Structures are given as structure tokens and as C-alpha cells.
């Protein structure tokens, strides 16, 4: 359903649903359905002065597929609703280019290979424990942090902008940056005025 | 959808995201079995999937009802500004029947007139103050708690159900019970499966188990 | 610590968990004191504040007991990331006091009547509403119903438990000339107590994060 | 007050604000009191009984927890609280892993002796960790190298939570339906809670506790 952006080798960010648009913030700000452009001007005004409450009335629901180490960083954003999966087994294997700029003792290709290898061994050990009757909740603890998980994320535009301020930044890990770029992309698509105003006055990051 | 409450109040649905299937989709992270799922989640206390259904209501209510309402913190509220917003200057005047049930020294319709009288005296003093040059943020402090205010309320289904458990109940003041009934009505029309499961498995209040819709 | 506000209000500190060091321990995720270093610890507080790392300050918590007019309480309660427990108008026995603006309050606005008259006019209507209320009560009318005729300047009381992070957001918005003068007075008192208990955080706050105007002008 | 959990974990109390009376004062919205336990604890039961839990939001705890990441992930799903997890950016990083005891597999008829499963887990852990160190040695930054480490790697965090949110936590984790590992951490949390707020804790078990192991 709807927009879908592939991230990393097997990940993605999919837009499930969206409630409202830029006008939803305007209506809430004026507190009126009948008496809900001077409107785009209002959006900028609210953003400039930090009147963020109206933006809480725009809501998004995303379906995200990401490695657990990315999900854990993501989940630290408490002002939102999450529902994580609880079953296929895939892992994020960094591409050689990911090691861009680092003078590694061994070739990038080899680093990618070493990572694929322990992932392989951990996974085969997991399947073995399972086959012997070991409980899934127990056997799964040997699986690596690059294992892909999936979750639904329902978040309002205000909370989404705080999310972007922290993750859509060069100081954030590249992997999470990629997901934040995808989220920003969808946000931009569905709320042009809010997103533009956000970049103009409130965006604290540097990659957008 | 706009349901009139009390003498001048109302509850109006502004927008809504998703429906019963949004919770099923969230639960699975992906016919009659979907209904079975909704029922299962409700029966075992798995409330998180219902956070993926969201509503935005426009409510016009007396400030004393609004204040009680705002205690439900897991939601978003945007109310008119007492300092700068234009108001309708309307006030909730209880009907004689509202009193009936309590032994009073004077007729219920008398209690109604006295309330309407003091409200009239307060309002008059307010305008007198405004015309005199007194700023609204100060002049409005003399207006009574039964003055009507308006606000936008964006809330997810899980939180909405928690609100109904507490407000759609005999222990809550009659005025807010009336609003909770309107909220429940709209909730039912938009999420019939979640609503029925809610009544059958999680509703802690009492009035919705007897009051239709 | 109890500070009077307005004519019959106040802000009173009930309790507090932690101090500046609580944010430092949380930032380092360490319950080790055998390495205390004021210099380094105070530097970390500035660093966190300067770079917007707010989560550590969530581990410092305050509980205040506030007495304020309902119109002030309404504005205050819009700060949702905190816990509030207010007196019950339906049951709790109120003391029935009201905020009567001082003539100086209006002093500064062109009025068609002496500031003194406004004060008298407000005091008069309050008295009338209050009497009606009692008159309704003496008739057997439930207070949850009779209290609706009471004006918005009626005083209420509530306990407020908030962490330092949320407290700073509150000050950013309320300890500012844009906020109503009345709530500004309460915010200054909250800031005074906050400064007393977490001097390092308060200073770093004023230096790197405070968005308002008045706290950099008015002492403590 | 510290309680060891699992093989290398623990739960320790860093701080606490208030006690049973903090909820009482909040409920009554009054700082003073003067002299009455019988009345105080009756109010506490009254509140718990009728579901009036806002007063309990005025009792706060700060815990320091050491737990395997898979347990932490479940724990962090409780949003009404404040968390700060260990970071090499402010503190030194440690590398330990949760190795299940053979007993953990009791009740399960596994074709592999429980004590051998324990062995296989340690085996994979040791190899993943060695690969990790090797990647570090080659010049791979930690943020990338650590992705090969297992979910049983131990982490640490500070957790500040009020009594109300704490009771909800127990209702979901201090129960036979929660994974065993988290049940053990929840038990420790319940123990510290009982110690600092005996009245609230007693009332909780009597009228509201939804779990079964407590």
C-alpha cells in the first residue's frame, strides 16, 4: 500500500496511512472546522514561533523493515505508537562502499565477507537449537543485531519533526540517516508547506 | 457528523485515520477472521494495536466539562485562546429536569433562573469592563465556569476507550457523561468491531452497556 | 520553600529527587561516586545543554504544590508531560478565594475608568457570584452544579510532579513576556526554586537553551 | 539496594522520591498532615480499589539496570518513563553476554542436553565477539562492527519511572506470560518497590495486580 522506499539491502519504509495534511494544522490552530494564501503564512508563523501543538493533528502510520540496531535507536522516540513483529530471517550486510573513508587493514570486500560469515554461523546455530526443541525465545538470543525486524509506527507531525532533528543528521549513524531521509521524503510528499516551513525555521539537522 | 450536547454544546468529527482493519493490520504488522482477531486482542488486553486508529474531534463544551476532559493527557488538544480568541459568550444553563432528583428548598426552574441571572450579571460586568478598555485576558476572569469553550481533540482508539471507561460512567458528572455518549456513538459508527469487542471485553464503565450506541 | 504569588496564591516545593549530579550520572549511566570531579561534572552539564542532549535531565524530578486562579491553571495544564492532581470541584471542600487584580495590573492601559474602579467592579461581581453559589448550596443543589456560576479567577490548588527537562520547556514558554503576566509570576517562582536545587543546570539552561527573555533580565 | 539477575545482570536503586505518604499528600492536595496511619493506608486502598491511580504518579524511582539487549528491548516498550542507555560516548563499554543455565531449559524435552545448549550459545557468542574484535583491529568503526554481536549482549540503562507506570510494568512483566528473563527483572523491581512503598505495594497486590507470579 501507498509509498514505499527501499533502504539498505533488504529494508524499507512504507507509508500505511495518513490523517490530514497541512490544512489540518491550520484548522487546529484556528480551532475551527467551519472557519478553519494566508494559510501557508500561518504555517510559517507557527513554525517560526515554535507553536508546535497544531502539528500534532497531522498523523502518519508507517510500516518499517530495519535491522534491530536501527530499530533500537528509533524506538527511543517515545512520543509515538509502535507495534513490532513477533517470521522470516534476513540480515543487513554492509556494502563495501559503506566503509567509505576508513583505511581498513583488509579489503572492504573482505569486511563484508567476514560479516556475512558470522551471520551465517549464528543463524545456522539458531536453526540447530530450534530443531533440537529449544524455545524460540531462547534460541533467538544468539542472533546478531543486524537481524531485520519490522514494525508499524504511528506518529504525529510534531513528533516526526523532533525525530528528524535528531536522526536526519550527519552526526547520526549512516544507517539511521538513510531511514530518516526516507521518512522526511514521505513527510515532504504529504505535507509540503509544513515540511518546507520546518526546513526554513526549525530543522536542526544538516542533511535535509 | 455533529451531535448536539446540552443546550448549546456539540461534538463534531473532524477527521479519522483508519478503521477496525487498521488495528488488525497493526497487530499482524502486515473476513470474519479479522473480526475474530479484533475480539482476541480486546479479550487478552493487547491494547497497542488500537493506537493505530486515530480521531480528531471538534468539541464545544462548558469550561468545567473541558477541564475534566483535559485530564486525559494521552491526546492532543488545541483550545480557543482566553486571551486572544473571539468567543460566542454562550453559557450552559442547566434545565429544571437536571436538578430534579434532589430535594431542593426551591423549585428546580427557580434554581435555573438564578443561575441564568448570575450569569447575566457576570456577562454584563465583563462587557462593561471591555468597553472601559480592560484587556480581554484580564476582563474575562469574571466570567463563570459554565461559559462555552471549543477545542480540537486528536486521540487514538486505545486512549479513546480509556476515556469512555472513565467518562461514560455513572461516577462521572452528568454533563460530561453526555459528551462521552456522543464520543462513543461516533466511535461505534467508525469502528463497529472494536467498539463491540470493547463493550464485551474491556469497558469498565456501566452506562454504555444499557444506553444504545 | 514557599513563595507567595498574586494576592492569595503560592508555589510551594513539596519534594525533589536528585540534583545536578543526577543528570551527570544518567548521562554516563553510572552509579559510581568514587570518581567525583566538580570541574568535569559541571563541564558535562554545559556540554549536554549546549548540544541539546535533554534526556539526562529527565532524571531530576520535582513536586510542587501550587495555588493559582483557574484561568492560570488552565494555561499551566496545557503542559502535558508532567503529573497533576487538582482539588475536586465536585467534592473537595474549597476555601473559595478569588484573584482580584491590583490597580497596578491595569496601570499601563488606557481605560475609561480609574484602575481603582476596575478592581472594585471585579470584587463586586465575585462577591455576587459567590453569594449566589452559597444560596444555591443552602437549597440542596449539588456543588458540582452550583459551582458552575463561580468566576474563572477562583483559586484552585494542585500538586505538580515534573522532571527538569519538562520544567525547562515550561519556563521557555511561561517565563516570557509573551505569556500572560499572571502566569509569568508563577514561572519566576518555579525558576527560583529550580535554580536553588539545580544551580548548574539552571545556569547552563540560561546560557545555552532558554528561549525566553525575562530570566536573563531578572535575577534568580 | 542491589539485586543480581541472571548470570551477570542486576537491578539497583539509584534514587527514590517520596514514599506511601507522597501519594496520600497528592491525593488530598495538601502538604501538611499532622499526626494517622490507619486513615492514611485506608485512603491508599480506597484509591487502588477504585482505579484512582494519578496520586501514585507522585512517587518516583530511578533504577540502574544491567540486562541483555533482548530483555531491554521488551522493557523499553514501556513508554511512560525515562531511559538513558549506556554509550561509549560518555562511559567505557563492557562486553559480557547472557549465557542461559541448563535449568533454564528444564520442562523442555530437547534432543540436546540442556547443558550442551548452554555450551553452543557460549560458543556462538565467543566467535561473534572474536569477529567483532577482529573487525575493530582492521579499522572498522564500532558502530558498524558491533552489528555482528548477539542479542544476549549485556547493556545498561538508567530508568526513572513513577509508581503508577511502575505498577503497569509489573502487571505486564511480573507474569508467567512474559518471557522468563524479564519476569526475573520484574520480580527484583517489585521487591524494591515493596521495600520503599509497602502500603501501596500491598494494596496493589490486593486490588489491582493483574499478573500471577507476584
XYZ file of C-alpha atoms in Angstrom, chain B residues 98-99 102 104, chain C residues 133 136-137 140-147:
15
model
C -31.260 18.441 35.583
C -31.931 19.347 39.205
C -32.540 16.231 44.543
C -34.289 21.448 46.970
C -23.351 29.872 44.903
C -27.780 27.544 45.697
C -25.914 25.285 48.101
C -29.721 21.413 48.360
C -28.229 21.877 44.904
C -25.193 19.605 44.351
C -21.973 21.620 44.463
C -20.809 20.075 41.181
C -23.705 22.057 39.748
C -23.759 25.167 41.925
C -20.035 25.759 41.377
